[PDB]
Coordinates of C-alpha atoms in Angstrom, one line a residue:
Chain A
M4 CA -33.6 86.2 247.7
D5 CA -34.4 85.1 244.2
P6 CA -36.6 87.2 241.6
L7 CA -37.0 83.9 239.6
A8 CA -38.1 82.1 242.9
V9 CA -41.6 81.3 241.5
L10 CA -39.9 79.8 238.4
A11 CA -37.5 77.7 240.4
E12 CA -40.5 76.5 242.3
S13 CA -42.7 75.4 239.4
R14 CA -39.7 73.8 237.6
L15 CA -42.1 74.3 234.8
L16 CA -42.8 77.2 232.4
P17 CA -45.5 77.1 229.9
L18 CA -45.3 79.1 226.8
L19 CA -48.3 80.7 225.2
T20 CA -48.8 82.0 221.7
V21 CA -52.0 84.1 221.7
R22 CA -54.5 83.4 218.9
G23 CA -56.9 85.7 220.7
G24 CA -59.8 83.4 221.9
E25 CA -58.1 81.9 225.0
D26 CA -59.5 81.9 228.5
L27 CA -56.5 83.7 230.1
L28 CA -57.9 84.2 233.5
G29 CA -59.2 80.5 233.4
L30 CA -55.8 79.3 232.4
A31 CA -54.2 81.5 235.1
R32 CA -56.2 79.9 237.9
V33 CA -55.6 76.3 236.7
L34 CA -51.9 77.0 236.5
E35 CA -51.8 78.4 240.0
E36 CA -54.0 75.6 241.3
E37 CA -51.6 73.2 240.0
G38 CA -48.3 74.5 241.7
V39 CA -47.1 76.3 238.6
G40 CA -47.1 80.2 239.1
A41 CA -45.1 81.5 236.0
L42 CA -46.1 81.8 232.4
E43 CA -44.5 83.0 229.2
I44 CA -46.4 84.9 226.6
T45 CA -44.5 85.0 223.3
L46 CA -44.4 88.2 221.4
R47 CA -44.7 86.5 218.0
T48 CA -48.2 88.3 217.7
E49 CA -49.2 91.8 218.9
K50 CA -51.9 90.0 220.9
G51 CA -49.1 88.8 223.0
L52 CA -48.9 92.3 224.5
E53 CA -52.7 92.5 225.0
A54 CA -52.4 89.2 226.9
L55 CA -49.7 90.4 229.3
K56 CA -52.0 93.4 229.9
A57 CA -54.9 91.1 230.5
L58 CA -52.9 88.9 233.0
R59 CA -51.3 91.7 235.0
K60 CA -53.4 91.0 238.1
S61 CA -53.5 87.3 237.7
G62 CA -50.8 86.6 240.4
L63 CA -48.7 84.8 237.7
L64 CA -44.9 85.5 237.4
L65 CA -45.3 86.6 233.7
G66 CA -42.5 86.2 231.2
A67 CA -42.2 87.8 227.8
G68 CA -40.7 85.5 225.2
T69 CA -39.2 86.1 221.7
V70 CA -38.1 89.6 222.9
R71 CA -35.8 90.5 219.9
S72 CA -34.9 94.3 220.5
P73 CA -34.6 96.8 223.5
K74 CA -37.8 98.5 222.4
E75 CA -39.7 95.2 222.2
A76 CA -38.3 94.6 225.6
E77 CA -39.5 98.0 227.0
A78 CA -43.0 97.4 225.5
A79 CA -43.3 94.0 227.2
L80 CA -42.4 95.5 230.6
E81 CA -45.0 98.2 230.3
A82 CA -47.4 95.5 229.4
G83 CA -46.9 93.7 232.8
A84 CA -43.9 91.5 232.2
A85 CA -41.7 90.7 235.1
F86 CA -38.9 88.9 233.1
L87 CA -37.7 88.7 229.5
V88 CA -36.7 85.9 227.3
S89 CA -35.2 85.9 223.7
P90 CA -34.1 82.9 221.5
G91 CA -30.4 84.1 221.4
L92 CA -28.4 86.5 223.4
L93 CA -29.0 90.3 222.7
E94 CA -26.5 92.5 224.6
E95 CA -28.7 95.5 224.0
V96 CA -31.8 93.8 225.5
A97 CA -29.5 92.9 228.5
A98 CA -28.6 96.6 228.9
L99 CA -32.4 97.4 228.9
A100 CA -32.9 94.7 231.5
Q101 CA -30.2 95.7 233.8
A102 CA -31.4 99.3 233.4
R103 CA -34.9 98.4 234.6
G104 CA -33.6 95.9 237.1
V105 CA -35.5 92.9 235.7
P106 CA -34.3 89.3 235.0
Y107 CA -33.2 88.5 231.3
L108 CA -32.8 84.9 230.2
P109 CA -31.0 85.0 226.9
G110 CA -31.1 81.7 224.9
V111 CA -27.7 79.9 224.7
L112 CA -26.3 76.7 223.2
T113 CA -22.5 76.5 223.1
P114 CA -20.0 76.7 225.9
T115 CA -18.6 79.9 224.3
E116 CA -22.2 81.4 224.3
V117 CA -22.4 80.5 228.0
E118 CA -19.2 82.4 228.9
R119 CA -20.3 85.4 226.9
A120 CA -23.7 85.5 228.8
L121 CA -21.9 84.9 232.1
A122 CA -19.6 87.9 231.3
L123 CA -22.8 90.1 231.3
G124 CA -23.6 88.9 234.8
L125 CA -26.4 86.5 233.4
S126 CA -26.5 83.1 235.2
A127 CA -30.0 81.9 234.5
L128 CA -29.9 81.0 230.7
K129 CA -32.4 79.7 228.2
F130 CA -31.2 76.5 226.4
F131 CA -32.8 76.7 222.9
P132 CA -33.7 74.8 220.8
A133 CA -33.4 72.2 223.5
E134 CA -34.6 68.9 221.8
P135 CA -32.8 69.1 218.5
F136 CA -29.6 69.9 220.4
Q137 CA -29.9 67.1 222.9
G138 CA -30.8 69.2 225.9
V139 CA -30.5 66.6 228.6
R140 CA -27.0 65.4 227.6
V141 CA -25.8 68.9 226.9
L142 CA -27.0 70.3 230.2
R143 CA -25.4 67.3 231.9
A144 CA -21.9 68.3 230.5
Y145 CA -22.6 72.0 231.6
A146 CA -23.5 70.9 235.2
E147 CA -19.8 70.0 235.7
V148 CA -18.0 72.9 233.9
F149 CA -20.6 75.6 234.5
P150 CA -21.6 74.8 238.1
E151 CA -22.9 78.3 238.5
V152 CA -25.4 78.5 235.7
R153 CA -29.1 77.4 236.0
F154 CA -30.8 76.7 232.7
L155 CA -34.2 77.1 231.3
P156 CA -34.5 74.4 228.4
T157 CA -37.3 75.0 225.8
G158 CA -37.8 73.9 222.3
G159 CA -39.5 70.7 221.1
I160 CA -39.5 69.1 224.7
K161 CA -42.1 66.4 225.1
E162 CA -43.6 64.9 228.2
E163 CA -41.4 61.8 228.0
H164 CA -38.2 63.9 228.3
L165 CA -39.1 65.2 231.7
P166 CA -37.8 62.5 234.0
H167 CA -34.4 62.8 232.4
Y168 CA -34.4 66.6 232.9
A169 CA -35.5 66.2 236.5
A170 CA -32.3 64.4 237.5
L171 CA -30.1 67.3 236.4
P172 CA -28.8 69.6 239.2
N173 CA -28.5 72.9 237.1
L174 CA -32.2 73.1 236.1
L175 CA -34.2 76.2 236.6
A176 CA -37.4 75.0 234.8
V177 CA -38.4 73.4 231.6
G178 CA -40.2 75.4 229.1
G179 CA -42.8 74.5 226.5
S180 CA -46.0 75.2 224.7
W181 CA -47.0 71.5 224.5
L182 CA -48.6 72.0 228.1
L183 CA -51.2 74.4 226.8
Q184 CA -52.9 72.6 223.9
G185 CA -56.5 71.6 224.5
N186 CA -59.2 72.8 226.9
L187 CA -59.0 73.8 230.6
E188 CA -59.4 70.2 232.0
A189 CA -56.9 69.1 229.1
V190 CA -54.2 71.7 229.9
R191 CA -54.7 71.1 233.7
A192 CA -53.9 67.4 233.1
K193 CA -50.8 68.0 231.1
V194 CA -49.6 70.5 233.7
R195 CA -50.4 68.2 236.6
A196 CA -48.5 65.3 234.7
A197 CA -45.4 67.4 233.7
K198 CA -45.3 68.7 237.3
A199 CA -45.2 65.2 238.6
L200 CA -42.7 63.9 236.0
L201 CA -40.4 66.5 237.4
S202 CA -39.3 65.6 241.0
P203 CA -40.4 62.0 241.6
Chain B
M4 CA -37.6 91.2 193.1
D5 CA -35.2 88.5 194.4
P6 CA -31.5 88.1 193.4
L7 CA -31.7 84.5 194.8
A8 CA -35.0 83.9 192.8
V9 CA -33.3 81.0 190.8
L10 CA -32.2 79.4 194.0
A11 CA -35.7 79.7 195.5
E12 CA -37.0 78.1 192.4
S13 CA -34.8 75.1 192.3
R14 CA -35.2 74.5 196.1
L15 CA -32.0 72.6 195.3
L16 CA -28.4 73.6 195.2
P17 CA -25.7 71.1 194.3
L18 CA -22.2 71.6 195.5
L19 CA -19.2 70.7 193.4
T20 CA -15.6 70.1 194.4
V21 CA -13.6 70.2 191.2
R22 CA -11.1 67.3 190.7
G23 CA -10.5 68.7 187.1
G24 CA -11.9 66.0 184.7
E25 CA -15.6 66.9 185.0
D26 CA -17.8 67.7 182.1
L27 CA -19.0 71.2 183.4
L28 CA -20.9 72.3 180.3
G29 CA -22.5 68.8 180.3
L30 CA -23.5 69.0 183.9
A31 CA -24.7 72.6 183.4
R32 CA -27.2 71.5 180.7
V33 CA -28.5 68.5 182.7
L34 CA -29.0 70.8 185.7
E35 CA -30.9 73.3 183.7
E36 CA -32.9 70.6 181.9
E37 CA -34.0 69.3 185.2
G38 CA -35.5 72.6 186.7
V39 CA -32.4 73.3 188.8
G40 CA -30.5 76.5 187.6
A41 CA -28.0 77.2 190.5
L42 CA -24.8 75.6 191.3
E43 CA -22.1 75.9 193.9
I44 CA -18.4 75.5 193.2
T45 CA -16.4 75.1 196.4
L46 CA -13.1 76.9 196.6
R47 CA -11.4 74.0 198.4
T48 CA -9.2 73.7 195.2
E49 CA -7.7 76.4 193.0
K50 CA -9.5 74.6 190.2
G51 CA -12.7 75.8 191.8
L52 CA -11.8 79.2 190.3
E53 CA -11.1 77.7 186.8
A54 CA -14.5 76.0 187.0
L55 CA -16.4 79.3 187.8
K56 CA -14.5 80.8 184.7
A57 CA -15.5 77.8 182.6
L58 CA -19.2 78.0 183.6
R59 CA -19.6 81.9 183.3
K60 CA -21.7 81.6 180.1
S61 CA -23.5 78.5 181.2
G62 CA -26.7 80.3 182.2
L63 CA -26.4 78.9 185.8
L64 CA -26.8 81.1 188.9
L65 CA -23.3 80.2 190.2
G66 CA -22.3 80.3 193.8
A67 CA -18.9 80.3 195.4
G68 CA -18.6 78.0 198.5
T69 CA -16.0 77.8 201.3
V70 CA -15.2 81.5 200.8
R71 CA -13.1 82.2 203.9
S72 CA -11.7 85.8 203.5
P73 CA -12.6 89.1 201.6
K74 CA -9.8 88.4 199.0
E75 CA -11.0 84.9 198.3
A76 CA -14.4 86.5 198.0
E77 CA -13.2 89.1 195.5
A78 CA -11.4 86.4 193.4
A79 CA -14.6 84.3 193.2
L80 CA -16.6 87.3 191.9
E81 CA -14.0 88.1 189.2
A82 CA -14.2 84.4 188.3
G83 CA -18.0 84.6 187.5
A84 CA -19.6 84.0 190.8
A85 CA -22.9 85.7 191.5
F86 CA -23.3 84.8 195.2
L87 CA -20.9 83.8 198.1
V88 CA -21.1 81.2 200.7
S89 CA -18.8 80.4 203.7
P90 CA -19.1 77.7 206.5
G91 CA -19.4 80.4 209.3
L92 CA -20.2 84.1 209.4
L93 CA -17.3 86.4 208.2
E94 CA -18.2 90.1 208.8
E95 CA -15.4 91.1 206.5
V96 CA -16.7 88.9 203.7
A97 CA -20.1 90.5 204.3
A98 CA -18.5 94.0 204.0
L99 CA -17.0 92.8 200.6
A100 CA -20.4 91.5 199.5
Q101 CA -22.4 94.5 200.4
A102 CA -19.7 96.6 198.7
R103 CA -20.1 94.7 195.5
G104 CA -23.8 94.4 195.9
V105 CA -24.0 90.6 195.7
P106 CA -25.7 88.1 198.0
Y107 CA -23.7 86.5 200.9
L108 CA -25.1 83.4 202.7
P109 CA -23.0 83.0 205.8
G110 CA -23.4 79.6 207.5
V111 CA -25.1 79.7 210.9
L112 CA -26.3 77.2 213.6
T113 CA -27.4 78.9 216.9
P114 CA -30.1 81.4 217.5
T115 CA -27.5 83.9 218.7
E116 CA -25.6 83.4 215.3
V117 CA -28.9 84.0 213.6
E118 CA -29.4 87.4 215.3
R119 CA -25.8 88.4 214.6
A120 CA -26.2 87.7 210.8
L121 CA -29.6 89.4 210.9
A122 CA -27.9 92.4 212.4
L123 CA -25.7 92.7 209.2
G124 CA -28.9 92.8 207.1
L125 CA -28.4 89.0 206.0
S126 CA -31.7 87.0 206.0
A127 CA -30.8 84.2 203.7
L128 CA -28.5 82.0 205.8
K129 CA -26.6 78.7 205.4
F130 CA -27.4 76.1 208.1
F131 CA -24.2 74.0 208.4
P132 CA -23.5 71.3 209.2
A133 CA -27.1 70.5 208.8
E134 CA -27.3 66.7 209.4
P135 CA -25.1 66.3 212.5
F136 CA -27.1 69.3 214.0
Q137 CA -30.5 67.9 213.2
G138 CA -31.3 70.4 210.4
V139 CA -35.0 69.6 210.0
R140 CA -35.9 69.9 213.7
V141 CA -33.7 73.0 214.2
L142 CA -35.1 74.8 211.2
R143 CA -38.6 73.9 212.5
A144 CA -37.9 75.8 215.8
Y145 CA -36.5 78.8 213.7
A146 CA -39.6 78.9 211.5
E147 CA -41.6 80.2 214.5
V148 CA -39.0 82.6 216.2
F149 CA -37.2 83.7 213.1
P150 CA -40.1 84.1 210.7
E151 CA -38.1 86.4 208.5
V152 CA -35.1 84.2 207.8
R153 CA -34.9 81.7 204.8
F154 CA -32.3 79.0 205.2
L155 CA -30.0 77.0 203.0
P156 CA -29.2 73.7 204.8
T157 CA -26.1 71.8 203.6
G158 CA -23.9 69.2 205.2
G159 CA -24.4 65.5 205.2
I160 CA -28.0 65.7 203.8
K161 CA -29.1 62.5 202.0
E162 CA -32.0 61.9 199.7
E163 CA -34.2 60.4 202.4
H164 CA -34.1 63.7 204.4
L165 CA -35.8 65.7 201.6
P166 CA -39.5 65.1 202.3
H167 CA -38.9 66.4 205.9
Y168 CA -37.2 69.5 204.6
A169 CA -39.9 70.1 202.0
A170 CA -42.6 70.6 204.6
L171 CA -40.7 73.5 206.3
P172 CA -41.9 77.0 205.4
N173 CA -38.5 78.9 205.9
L174 CA -36.5 76.9 203.3
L175 CA -34.6 78.6 200.5
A176 CA -33.0 75.4 199.1
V177 CA -31.2 72.3 200.3
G178 CA -27.5 72.1 199.4
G179 CA -25.4 69.1 198.8
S180 CA -22.7 67.3 196.9
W181 CA -24.4 63.9 197.0
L182 CA -26.3 65.0 193.8
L183 CA -23.2 65.1 191.8
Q184 CA -21.5 61.7 192.2
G185 CA -21.6 59.5 189.2
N186 CA -22.0 60.1 185.5
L187 CA -24.3 62.4 183.5
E188 CA -27.3 60.0 183.3
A189 CA -26.5 59.2 187.1
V190 CA -26.4 62.8 188.3
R191 CA -29.5 63.7 186.2
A192 CA -31.4 60.9 188.1
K193 CA -30.3 62.0 191.5
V194 CA -31.3 65.6 190.6
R195 CA -34.6 64.6 189.1
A196 CA -35.3 62.5 192.3
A197 CA -34.2 65.2 194.9
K198 CA -36.2 67.7 192.8
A199 CA -39.3 65.5 193.2
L200 CA -38.7 64.6 196.8
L201 CA -39.0 68.4 197.4
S202 CA -42.6 69.7 196.8
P203 CA -44.8 66.6 196.5
Chain C
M4 CA 8.4 70.9 215.6
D5 CA 5.2 70.5 217.5
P6 CA 4.6 71.5 221.3
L7 CA 1.6 69.2 221.3
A8 CA 3.7 66.4 219.7
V9 CA 3.1 64.1 222.8
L10 CA -0.6 64.7 222.5
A11 CA -0.6 63.9 218.8
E12 CA 1.3 60.7 219.6
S13 CA -1.1 59.4 222.3
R14 CA -4.2 60.3 220.2
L15 CA -5.6 60.0 223.7
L16 CA -6.0 62.5 226.6
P17 CA -7.4 61.4 229.9
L18 CA -9.1 63.9 232.0
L19 CA -8.8 63.8 235.8
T20 CA -10.9 65.5 238.5
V21 CA -9.0 65.2 241.7
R22 CA -11.0 64.0 244.7
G23 CA -7.7 63.9 246.7
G24 CA -6.9 60.1 247.4
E25 CA -5.6 59.2 243.9
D26 CA -2.3 57.5 243.3
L27 CA -0.9 60.2 240.8
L28 CA 2.6 59.0 240.5
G29 CA 1.1 55.4 240.0
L30 CA -1.3 56.6 237.4
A31 CA 1.5 58.6 235.8
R32 CA 3.7 55.5 235.3
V33 CA 0.8 53.3 234.0
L34 CA -0.1 56.1 231.4
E35 CA 3.5 56.4 230.2
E36 CA 3.8 52.6 230.2
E37 CA 0.9 52.4 227.9
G38 CA 2.0 54.9 225.1
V39 CA -0.1 57.8 226.5
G40 CA 2.2 60.6 227.8
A41 CA -0.3 63.6 228.3
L42 CA -2.9 64.1 231.0
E43 CA -5.4 66.8 231.8
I44 CA -6.2 67.9 235.4
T45 CA -9.4 69.8 235.6
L46 CA -9.5 72.9 237.8
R47 CA -13.0 72.1 239.0
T48 CA -11.4 71.7 242.5
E49 CA -8.5 73.6 244.1
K50 CA -6.9 70.2 244.5
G51 CA -6.5 70.2 240.7
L52 CA -3.7 72.7 241.3
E53 CA -2.1 70.5 244.1
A54 CA -2.2 67.6 241.6
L55 CA -0.4 69.6 238.8
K56 CA 2.3 70.4 241.5
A57 CA 2.5 66.8 242.5
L58 CA 2.9 65.6 238.8
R59 CA 5.4 68.3 237.7
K60 CA 8.3 65.8 237.5
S61 CA 6.3 62.9 236.3
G62 CA 7.4 63.2 232.7
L63 CA 3.7 63.7 231.6
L64 CA 2.7 66.5 229.1
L65 CA 0.3 68.0 231.7
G66 CA -2.8 70.0 230.6
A67 CA -5.0 72.2 232.7
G68 CA -8.7 71.9 231.9
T69 CA -11.7 74.1 232.8
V70 CA -9.4 77.2 232.8
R71 CA -12.0 79.9 232.8
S72 CA -10.0 83.3 233.3
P73 CA -6.4 84.7 232.7
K74 CA -5.7 84.4 236.4
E75 CA -6.8 80.8 236.6
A76 CA -4.7 80.3 233.6
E77 CA -1.5 81.9 235.2
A78 CA -2.0 79.8 238.4
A79 CA -2.2 76.6 236.3
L80 CA 1.1 77.4 234.6
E81 CA 2.8 78.1 237.9
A82 CA 1.5 74.8 239.1
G83 CA 3.4 72.9 236.3
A84 CA 0.9 73.0 233.4
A85 CA 2.3 72.9 229.9
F86 CA -1.0 73.6 228.0
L87 CA -4.4 75.1 228.8
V88 CA -7.9 74.0 228.0
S89 CA -11.3 75.8 228.6
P90 CA -14.9 74.6 227.6
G91 CA -15.4 77.7 225.3
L92 CA -13.1 80.3 223.7
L93 CA -11.8 83.0 226.1
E94 CA -9.8 85.7 224.1
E95 CA -8.3 86.9 227.4
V96 CA -7.0 83.4 228.3
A97 CA -5.6 83.3 224.7
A98 CA -3.8 86.6 225.3
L99 CA -2.3 85.1 228.6
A100 CA -1.3 82.0 226.6
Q101 CA 0.3 83.8 223.7
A102 CA 2.1 86.0 226.3
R103 CA 3.6 83.0 228.0
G104 CA 4.2 81.1 224.8
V105 CA 2.1 78.0 225.7
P106 CA -0.5 76.2 223.7
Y107 CA -4.2 77.0 224.4
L108 CA -7.0 74.7 223.1
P109 CA -10.2 76.7 223.4
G110 CA -13.4 74.5 223.1
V111 CA -15.5 75.2 220.0
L112 CA -18.6 73.8 218.3
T113 CA -19.8 75.9 215.4
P114 CA -18.1 76.8 212.1
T115 CA -18.3 80.5 213.1
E116 CA -16.6 79.6 216.5
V117 CA -13.9 77.8 214.4
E118 CA -13.2 80.9 212.3
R119 CA -13.1 83.1 215.4
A120 CA -10.5 80.8 217.1
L121 CA -8.5 80.6 213.8
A122 CA -8.5 84.4 213.7
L123 CA -6.5 84.3 217.0
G124 CA -3.9 82.0 215.4
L125 CA -5.4 78.9 217.3
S126 CA -5.5 75.7 215.0
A127 CA -5.7 73.0 217.6
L128 CA -9.3 73.2 219.1
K129 CA -11.3 71.4 221.7
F130 CA -14.7 70.1 220.4
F131 CA -17.0 70.1 223.4
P132 CA -19.4 68.7 224.3
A133 CA -18.5 66.2 221.7
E134 CA -21.1 63.3 222.1
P135 CA -24.3 65.4 222.5
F136 CA -23.2 67.4 219.4
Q137 CA -22.4 64.4 217.3
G138 CA -18.6 64.8 217.4
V139 CA -17.7 62.2 214.7
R140 CA -20.1 63.5 212.0
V141 CA -19.3 67.2 212.9
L142 CA -15.6 66.7 212.8
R143 CA -16.1 64.9 209.4
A144 CA -17.7 68.0 207.9
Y145 CA -14.9 70.2 209.4
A146 CA -12.2 67.9 207.8
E147 CA -13.2 69.2 204.3
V148 CA -13.9 73.0 205.0
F149 CA -11.4 73.5 207.9
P150 CA -8.5 71.4 206.5
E151 CA -6.0 73.3 208.7
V152 CA -7.6 72.6 212.1
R153 CA -6.8 69.6 214.4
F154 CA -9.4 68.9 217.0
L155 CA -9.5 67.6 220.5
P156 CA -13.0 66.0 221.1
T157 CA -14.1 65.6 224.7
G158 CA -17.4 65.3 226.4
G159 CA -19.4 62.1 227.0
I160 CA -17.2 60.0 224.5
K161 CA -17.3 56.3 225.3
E162 CA -15.1 53.4 224.2
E163 CA -17.4 52.3 221.4
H164 CA -17.1 55.7 219.7
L165 CA -13.3 55.4 219.2
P166 CA -13.1 53.5 215.9
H167 CA -15.3 56.1 214.3
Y168 CA -13.0 58.9 215.6
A169 CA -9.9 57.0 214.5
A170 CA -10.9 57.2 210.8
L171 CA -11.0 61.0 210.8
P172 CA -8.0 62.9 209.4
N173 CA -8.2 66.1 211.5
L174 CA -7.9 64.4 214.9
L175 CA -5.4 65.6 217.5
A176 CA -6.6 63.3 220.4
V177 CA -9.8 62.2 222.0
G178 CA -10.3 63.4 225.5
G179 CA -12.2 61.8 228.4
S180 CA -12.5 61.0 232.0
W181 CA -14.0 57.6 231.4
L182 CA -10.4 56.2 231.1
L183 CA -9.7 56.9 234.6
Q184 CA -12.4 55.2 236.7
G185 CA -11.4 52.2 238.7
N186 CA -8.1 51.0 240.1
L187 CA -4.6 50.9 238.5
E188 CA -5.0 47.6 236.7
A189 CA -8.6 48.8 235.7
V190 CA -7.4 52.2 234.3
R191 CA -4.4 50.5 232.5
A192 CA -6.9 48.2 230.8
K193 CA -9.2 51.0 229.6
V194 CA -6.1 53.0 228.4
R195 CA -4.7 50.0 226.6
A196 CA -8.1 49.4 225.0
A197 CA -8.9 53.0 223.9
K198 CA -5.3 53.2 222.7
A199 CA -5.9 50.2 220.5
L200 CA -9.4 51.2 219.3
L201 CA -7.6 54.2 217.9
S202 CA -5.4 53.3 214.9
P203 CA -6.3 49.7 214.0

């Protein structure tokens, strides 16, 4: 029994930076209509918090992104977040997450970073920034030598990258914000498309 | 009030490996004539020290590069250096730098490395080796999630890379040695050119 | 006097994942016939152990790869391994290796990782995953600022990459499994070829 089961099932994790006019509930529905029931609200704006609050009942597995301290981590959880994400590994955020019994996906890049995370009992890791660092080819090398790690790649991933990611066996989901630009029929399309480019 | 103000103003930081026949004072003048008042002398040769001594009165903001230990760091400062640079983060060099109240730009690459530096109160970071690691695309991802960090990219950067770097908002200066190959009218040209390719 | 002298002499280090039907002694002979007297058996399968046992008398400098804990490290050594390799740096594996007086080549990628290894007295380092991370261009930047480190690049390296690696001055050997796919006359060819593409 997996707490990231929803995540594993989408294979897809949109990220959202709130500018404050978004139709959140609208978005929520489209996402869940399309087979994608997780979403990540970045805390790069205080409105990211208000948006977790607003989406609490939405039925989405909600993630909090850019969580950069134990306090920001606590705040996210009290806002409705079910999992935490940060760009690099914060041991103190992992201590908060294990304390509250919620999943924490620290970002990693190097094999050494992978061991360090593993050493904290974390085996579901962000890979960030994925595109500049050659996500697909890197996660292919980690499939062999880290057979126990699942990865959440994010960072500059475009649609055309998807079929390459879909062939990897150590893939938890692919993250991005690219999915979410446009209007509700726009976003739906992109989601439906990325959903299809993964598992063909 | 910024101790790296000169650096921010050039946007450009040449690096120099002394082979011992260079016209340092000549070079100094050309640099300052061209809007570029900082320069980095690498300590890959003992003559790097003699060159800091020689350039002490030049009016250049002088940096010491490849500083790989607290002692090498002290020596650089007694030679006339106003800021220290190393290829990776050395906590003990940061302790020497905070002790002497001078700027230290540790090299970083990964998000995790970025946090670790930040945790030492360092928010002006080397990004090295920039070109192999896709400097521009990486620093673009860090602009969003590390909005408080300024970066000094160095390592294999060529002229043609500049206009891409110039559009980033988290750029302290671009470093390189490529600027400094040739003769005084040669170097001047390259400096004038890189100076122009940045901010268009 | 160098314990990795054989390694330095091949310039080439095949890696082998045992599926359990291989002609090990056959392979051994071909390797040593071809100027290549080191070989790396990955511990991604328990049969990797049986293969170290089987090759103990072969006259090969045998390495153990994917060693991810002090215990796995001990086991490898009792199986006949003369050197240890892991994808990232494990301090506890380095303590086992220094205890038993055998070489340990932790994998590294970043300048900071390089210092950390150096700080443990390790100056022969794996560079992994080499190809996604632009091995050649990265090891070229490290040649200047880490003039004391020799590197063992591995990870997605193909034949055509070799002449670029061969020009670097800080190269201990290039690792890969690509060398070992096929049949004994097949493998021989690939070895003879990679051996030649290095030092021309």
